[PDB]
RNA sequence: AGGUUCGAAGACGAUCAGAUACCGUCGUAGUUCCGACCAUAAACGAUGCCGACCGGCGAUGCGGCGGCGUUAUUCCCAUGACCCGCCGGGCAGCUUCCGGGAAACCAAAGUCUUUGGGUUCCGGGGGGAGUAUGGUUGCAAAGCUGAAACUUAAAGGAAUUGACGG
């Protein structure tokens, strides 16, 4: 985004950093070396949100020219991402897929879950090597959330930022759908979204089972 | 030792052409180096070069403009005659529609249409289609 | 292709990667071919037209898919100057 | 009574695509051979290369499989290979001819020099490769016709080239390889670039994207 | 036979061809 | 690799000619010890006086009488 | 058909790698070629460490460890099951087994 | 021992839970009485094998999701998933550990010196990766 | 990448690279004022000398020659010359 | 010259149907050094040399250049041992649909029908045969150079499936 009103804003920012979203890994992949901006004495590689930023927009611009919402398909093998993922594709009308990739699903049209996607977004490289590697079969473009370290071989818009941090991944699941909601006729630009980032994060199983109980002995007394 | 500037610089582009880089850079630069890139740029396989001129032998950056296929070198340069560039020419161009073959002749360096147009031989230097 | 009597004898003409401008063959699975939305002036919204990008399967292969396509953006104005 | 599940089958069914070269353009790959009979209906020819019965040496001597190759196409410009193993011949025969059918390629012509009519010939030399098998096919005069061993001449035929001249080196008593070879020279026949070509491209609506409002209605 | 059994008794044999060249 | 000098004609020339020895075909084309010992002499008929009429075994996995004559 | 990439042996700037014998058929084999086992045997064994510590005078006695370099021609590695054969794909690994230390 | 389920058994009773869970539940008899005329079962002694597997999977269900799905499971998924948002986000700290670097960072993207962050003292000693091999 | 401006790399890489390897070659070592104390003069010495060098008026020595550049002694300052 | 160990030949004892061997006890030449020969090895990376280009990564040896910090001494710099990098020359490794190849595999065995950077050696179906003869070298053993008649429809290579394995 060239223009002023799609600029990068001060409670984003905060939201990125308060996420991390800008520390990747201690390796750095020599297709993300142009998006990296310095590693610290820490040896942990930061990225450029400012970078990260633009990819975002144009990864949001390519979902929104898509005329069929549900013709672009969002997945993640990895359960910090498929509530991501889960929740996008109920806000923005994709079509999830959250845990096994069963293989043959854009090559093989016998089994029941054989589906022809326009575009493919992408956890993690890495995790989802097979659906990438399947999209090559079908003329499939898709756009991947690569952290510091993954490879590139078959994305366009990889989102140069973090794929670890069930924080991190959550809140730019989040900032994807709500810029292509927000770049569709549905959201007017002035006011924060009413869809809260946390909704998009995963958490662990240990912390499902004891949260709402300590909640509801908060609202019992 | 390097004993071919020329096919050096010509397998320099080939490489690159066929790794799809926008640039290429030719370490060392000759007269008979710039006058092939300049009738392979006035026939449009490639764009713009620079000289970048040392006190030593020179180099070229080169602009690929990815419309290359071959550019091979001919390092034996023999005496090819007007009566029989055209056997050349059916062993080395692809096709009669398009290909060149390049040979310095007396009257400079220039492709095999123009030699056979000004009516002279020389020696092959290279081709490129 | 055009022949001298002018007309085009040549029954479809290939599309060519925008990125490295070679012939994506008719069997090419790999290749893409990518619309990206632009916004209008103010407001930021979908205005209905876009902008269309190829890439063929060798190039989108070997990984720098992903700087083709941003520096077509930078090119078209899509991604800022500043980037 | 073909019920295809493809949104392309689902688009050529409805005929909302005119013509093999609109996904040919936009190289989406074909799924379903009742695709391409839509549009070469009586005009596909068929032929039976070779029936080379391979077998896998087990505890009961040898079980035998026949591996069948076919080579398709109109005579004006689609051609292709396909082969199949089964366990029996006619089951072989049938699968090869959907398996050449689904491999179905444009064939660039161009002219040996002065184009004047409709082009005969290869637009330039090109060159095959399977296994160790080399074909090399060379543009050639008008008339000359097509000269090679039988197995690329009939495939050439079925390509619609007129003229052609060969030259194959390495083992072409392998006949898969050898028409396998002859395929690729064939198709890389487009991939090969010519100044002719050197236009900058325009894009169109993918067939998908045209009639997004169609697919969402009709195959649903 | 091993090959350098062959080359062993080939050695034999030239050496038996010398001596009968040398008594002749 | 080879040669390729604009002046190397001598030496490929030479290399040729000391190369062509090493195909059967040309050895016995070029230096006669084959057309010595060829009972016809280079010939492609010839004439004989019949000595003996013999029967020759015919080859392994076959089972046969040749007729021949000792000529 | 070569098996390993490195012929079995670790030498690649070497010309030529002094020999040693076998410790159990005693086989010339290159150095690097052998299978070397560095064992840390406990002097005393578990068995018998219970008897040795009740008998010793000292009031802690830290009983010694016996330290030998033990090299294998291939032969008798693989007899003794030192080493063993591994698939294609499994031969390529270089990691040790294993020490299953928990 | 020797109780191991087979396909046939496996396949007919994720078929049947998913056609018919509205009418089946997590009785044996019932369900044993609702497979009789769901389906055309040839032999009794295969159709309460049928009928333990799906109350078993049944009361698997009433628990937790298995490979074999209903679409009011997912419907009622994805109407409960959606909960526990905080009344605070995780997100909105009042201060923010910040790099050296990284505050260079946000300077040259013109958002450096805002209240929220807070910069830290940086790692000295550039300790990090492992030693290499064993030991 | 593919779009590596060899015409104007920037000058982290121009200095990171060797110096026959660079665009153009330029030496890495350079000319120093040396001033060595109890003196006036100041010397002119290369930052890669191989000999042992002195100030005329000051009997103590100014560099030790090292693998690759002057070892200044220790209480000598030095000043660059036109970089 | 010197000869401890080991150990061709050899003896003996075993083992075995036989056992001129594998195993054991001895044990000659040799194994060690000096001088003079010999010029051969699966002398292997079964892979010419010089040169150019064509991916990524982590290491390692040498040299050089930078940098937070820890350490060694002393009152400070250097200067050594670590830590993070860069450069160049090396022995290599991992990965890659660069590309190649019959494949195994190979960043060279790539840049090869889109065939030409320079140059050396060398192969032409399998045997006969590294034989015969001639020459030459050597004290010898042998080394180098090196055919033919005749014979044969295959011999080979890489992978696959099976069958078998003390
Ligand atoms: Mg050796
Ligand atoms: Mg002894
Ligand atoms: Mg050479
Ligand atoms: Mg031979
Ligand atoms: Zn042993």
């Keep these: 985004g060239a223009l002023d009103v799609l600029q990068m804003k001060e409670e984003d920012v905060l939201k990125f950093l308060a996420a991390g979203t800008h520390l990747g890994g201690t390796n750095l992949d020599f297709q993300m070396e142009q998006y990296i901006y310095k590693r610290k004495s820490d040896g942990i590689y930061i990225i450029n949100l400012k970078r990260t930023w633009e990819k975002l927009l144009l990864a949001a611009r390519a979902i929104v020219a898509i005329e069929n919402p549900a013709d672009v398909s969002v997945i993640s093998s990895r359960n910090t991402g498929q509530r991501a993922v889960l929740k996008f594709a109920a806000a923005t009308g994709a079509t999830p897929i959250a845990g096994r990739f069963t293989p043959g699903t854009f090559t093989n049209q016998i089994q029941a879950a054989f589906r022809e996607p326009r575009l493919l977004v992408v956890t993690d490289p890495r995790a989802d090597h097979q659906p990438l590697t399947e999209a090559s079969y079908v003329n499939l473009p898709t756009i991947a959330l690569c952290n510091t370290d993954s490879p590139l071989r078959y994305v366009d818009i990889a989102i140069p930022c973090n794929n670890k941090g069930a924080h991190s991944v959550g809140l730019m699941w989040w900032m994807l759908a709500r810029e292509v909601l927000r770049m569709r006729g549905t959201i007017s630009r002035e006011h924060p979204w009413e869809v809260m980032p946390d909704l998009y994060f995963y958490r662990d199983p240990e912390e499902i089972e004891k949260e709402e109980q300590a909640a509801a002995e908060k609202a019992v007394t | 030792v390097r004993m071919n500037v020329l096919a050096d610089a010509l397998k320099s582009i080939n490489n690159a052409e066929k790794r799809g880089k926008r640039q290429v850079l030719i370490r060392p630069c000759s007269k008979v180096i710039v006058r092939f890139l300049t009738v392979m740029m006035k026939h449009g396989y490639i764009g713009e070069f620079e000289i970048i001129d040392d006190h030593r032998a020179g180099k070229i950056v080169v602009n690929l403009t990815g419309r290359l296929n071959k550019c091979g070198v001919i390092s034996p340069r023999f005496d090819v005659q007007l009566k029989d560039l055209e056997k050349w020419q059916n062993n080395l161009l692809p096709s009669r529609q398009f290909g060149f073959i390049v040979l310095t002749t007396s009257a400079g360096i220039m492709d095999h249409e123009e030699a056979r147009r000004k009516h002279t031989g020389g020696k092959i230097l290279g081709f490129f289609f | ?83 | 009574e073909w019920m295809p599940v493809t949104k392309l089958g689902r688009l050529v069914k409805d005929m909302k695509i005119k013509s093999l070269e609109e996904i040919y353009l936009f190289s989406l790959p074909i799924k379903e051979s009742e695709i391409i009979d839509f549009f070469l209906g009586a005009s596909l020819k068929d032929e039976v290369l070779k029936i080379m019965p391979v077998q896998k040496q087990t505890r009961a001597g040898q079980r035998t499989r026949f591996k069948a190759f076919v080579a398709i196409g109109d005579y004006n410009g689609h051609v292709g290979l396909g082969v199949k193993c089964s366990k029996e011949v006619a089951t072989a025969i049938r699968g090869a001819i959907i398996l050449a059918k689904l491999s179905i390629v444009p064939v660039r012509r161009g002219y040996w020099g002065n184009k004047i009519g409709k082009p005969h010939t290869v637009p330039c030399k090109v060159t095959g490769r399977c296994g160790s098998v080399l074909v090399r096919l060379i543009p050639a005069p008008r008339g000359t016709g097509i000269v090679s061993a039988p197995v690329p001449k009939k495939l050439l035929m079925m390509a619609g080239i007129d003229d052609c001249y060969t030259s194959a080196r390495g083992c072409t008593a392998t006949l898969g390889n050898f028409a396998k070879a002859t395929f690729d020279a064939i198709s890389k026949t487009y991939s090969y670039l010519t100044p002719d070509l050197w236009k900058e491209t325009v894009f169109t609506k993918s067939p998908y994207q045209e009639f997004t409002d169609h697919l969402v209605k009709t195959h649903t | 036979m091993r090959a350098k059994w062959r080359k062993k008794r080939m050695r034999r044999l030239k050496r038996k061809r010398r001596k009968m060249r040398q008594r002749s | 690799g080879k040669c390729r000098g604009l002046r190397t004609a001598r030496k490929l020339r030479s290399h040729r000619r000391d190369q062509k020895w090493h195909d059967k075909q040309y050895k016995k084309a070029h230096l006669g010890t084959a057309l010595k010992a060829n009972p016809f002499g280079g010939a492609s008929h010839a004439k004989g006086i019949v000595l003996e009429k013999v029967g020759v075994e015919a080859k392994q996995p076959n089972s046969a009488i040749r007729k021949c004559v000792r000529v | 058909t070569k098996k390993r990439r490195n012929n079995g042996r670790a030498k690649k700037g070497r010309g030529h790698v002094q020999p040693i014998r076998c410790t159990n058929c005693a086989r010339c084999v290159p150095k690097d070629k052998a299978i070397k086992k560095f064992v840390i045997r406990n002097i005393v064994e578990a068995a018998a460490v219970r008897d040795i510590s009740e008998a010793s005078v000292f009031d802690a006695y830290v009983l010694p460890k016996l330290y030998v370099k033990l090299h294998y021609c291939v032969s008798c590695a693989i007899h003794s099951k030192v080493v063993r054969n591994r698939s294609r794909e499994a031969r390529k690994d270089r990691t040790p087994p294993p020490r299953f230390r928990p | 021992m020797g109780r191991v389920r087979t396909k046939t058994v496996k396949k007919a009773a994720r078929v049947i839970i998913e056609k018919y869970y509205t009418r089946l539940g997590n009785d044996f008899h019932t369900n044993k009485r609702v497979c009789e005329e769901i389906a055309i079962i040839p032999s009794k002694k295969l159709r309460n094998k049928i009928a333990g597997y799906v109350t078993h999977l049944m009361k698997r269900i009433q628990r937790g999701p298995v490979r074999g799905i209903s679409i009011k499971l997912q419907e009622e998924e994805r109407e409960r998933r959606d909960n526990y948002v905080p009344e605070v986000s995780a997100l909105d700290q009042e201060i923010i550990e910040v790099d050296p670097d990284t505050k260079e960072m946000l300077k040259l993207l013109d958002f450096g010196s805002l209240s929220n962050l807070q910069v830290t003292q940086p790692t000295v000693g550039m300790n990090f990766k492992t030693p290499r091999g064993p030991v | 990448p593919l779009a590596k401006d060899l015409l104007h790399p920037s000058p982290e890489e121009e200095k990171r690279k060797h110096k026959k390897k660079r665009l153009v070659q330029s030496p890495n070592s350079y000319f120093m004022d040396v001033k060595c104390p109890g003196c006036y003069k100041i010397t002119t010495v290369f930052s890669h000398a191989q000999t042992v060098v002195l100030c005329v008026g000051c009997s103590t020595v100014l560099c030790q020659p090292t693998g690759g550049k002057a070892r200044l002694t220790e209480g000598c300052s030095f000043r660059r010359k036109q970089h």
């Design chain 3, 1 to 83: 292709m055009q022949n001298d009597a002018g007309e085009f004898v040549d029954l479809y003409v290939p599309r060519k990667c925008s990125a490295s401008n070679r012939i994506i063959g008719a069997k090419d699975h790999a290749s893409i071919q990518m619309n990206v939305a632009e916004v209008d002036k103010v407001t930021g919204r979908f205005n209905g037209q876009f902008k269309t990008y190829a890439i063929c399967g060798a190039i989108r292969r070997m990984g720098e898919s992903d700087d083709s396509i941003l520096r077509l953006a930078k090119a078209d104005g899509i991604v800022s100057k500043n980037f």
